[PDB]
């Protein structure tokens, strides 16, 4: 029973909130620019944290490495029971890792066990006694970290270069027009010739940024991952318990010096990995923000080419209805059918508190309808 004259006034009223979107849209672009530039500075101060943290880690590693070379100058095994535990440690390790890879991981259990037995035969129980596995598994982790930062940093600096060049345009500089509440908003006269350069630069930055199941990957990569399971086997934790204090007191002291430097180096390596993980998030954030910037610029452009025609309503209200009229409508809402930019009719649901005698009725309808329209492309 809604008068056509009212539907027309709703169309007049709703069409004027389309011009507020073009303004809001440009602000969304400029607000995203702020967040990207904010994250960029947070990345830089994080990089300065990594450069301080790298030195401390590196110094701790040279002291650890300086310690293991002095323990290889004295390479003999003190107890001769060690040599007999080695040939009962080795078979046990092979089985516990094979059993793991088959149960937890995948196929190739025997392949892993073979690669391990071969390496353990080219190995000695002294290497175990001096925690030689932990030294190697730390020095390699240190190199993986150095590589990860090298890659991430160079991906980031390229994208940051493309982005800073894009943000040197004055389209992104805040203007008073963005805050006008009574006077209308107007895009630049040459937006069609600014759209494509910008969008491509956002695409180029998105490209630049683009880079237990964990143990299974490692055991597949190198069978030495099995040596994380020394604890499970008895003879091996006994090789590690051997006191050489009576037999070779000089070896025992150097081993205690190494273990000290080892724990420090590991602490500072876990600290570096947490900063690296924080840097990774800044990288993902920036990729997430660039995707928004793309969707926002398209929305501005989409709005721009659709609103240049003033011959008919931007938003035309076709029907208003309630649970009285349709009765398929839910009870506490009214449904407004809308033809936005002469596209397929969009249906909007607004609660009766905003529907009945509310001046923010058509502001709600228009904002909702435009949100749906935006989703459609
Ligand atoms: C790494 O070195 C060890 C040395 O202990 C190799 O294990 C040894 O392998 C030989 C032959 O492969 C075994 O000899 C056989 O023993 C059985 C039962 O004792 C006997 O019936 C056979 O006639 C033969 O004498 C030996 O026992 C075994 N020792 C241990 C402690 O396992 C191992 O094969 C080497 N790894 C590689 C990849 O070569
Ligand atoms: C060689 O190693 C064995 C074990 O690795 C040592 O045996 C230990 O001896 C003490 C003293 O009798 C016992 O209390 C421990 O329980 C033994 N450990 C094990 C695992 O059996 C042995 O003392 C070492 N020999 C030398 C000369 O250091
Ligand atoms: C440890 O060696 C690395 C590589 O040469 C170097 O970066 C670091 O400064 C060294 N630390 C010390 C204390 O010499
Ligand atoms: C596995 O690790 C050992 C020592 O950590 C190394 O000598 C060997 O080359 C590694 N193998 C592979 C395939 O990475
Ligand atoms: C952004 O970074 C923070 C910490 O740097 C992280 O907690 C958050 O998950 C990141 N968000 C995205 C979308 O990557
Ligand atoms: C808007 O229309 C122009 C052509 O008039 C076109 O080049 C541009 O890609 C359109 N933008 C969107 C988001 O559809």
Residue numbers in the entry: 25 to 213, 239 to 260, 281 to 446
The authors write:
Upon expression in the presence of the α-mannosidase I inhibitor kifunensine to generate uniform oligomannose N-glycans, purified Clu-Δ(214–238) crystallized at acidic pH in two distinct lattice types, crystal forms I and II, diffracting to 2.8-Å and 3.5-Å resolution, respectively. Crystal form I contained one copy of Clu-Δ(214–238) while crystal form II contained two independent copies. The asymmetric unit of crystal form I is shown in orthogonal views. The dashed line indicates a disordered loop, residues 261–280. The three conformations in the crystal lattices differed slightly in their domain orientations, with root-mean-square deviation (r.m.s.d.) values of 1.5–2.0 Å (Cα positions). While the DD seems fairly rigid, its linkers to helices α2 and α10 deviate considerably between crystal forms, indicating structural plasticity. Importantly, the model of the WT structure contains extended unstructured regions, including disordered tails at the C terminus of the β-chain (residues 199–227) and at the N terminus of the α-chain (residues 228–244). These tails are generated by furin cleavage in the unstructured sequence of WT Clu that is deleted in Clu-Δ(214–238).
Clusterin (apolipoprotein J), a conserved glycoprotein abundant in blood and cerebrospinal fluid, functions as a molecular chaperone and apolipoprotein. The Clu structure is composed of three domains, a coiled-coil (CC) domain, a small helical domain containing all disulfide bridges (hereafter disulfide domain, DD) and a C-terminal α/β roll-like (AB) domain. Structure-based mutational analysis demonstrated that two disordered, hydrophobic peptide tails enable diverse activities.
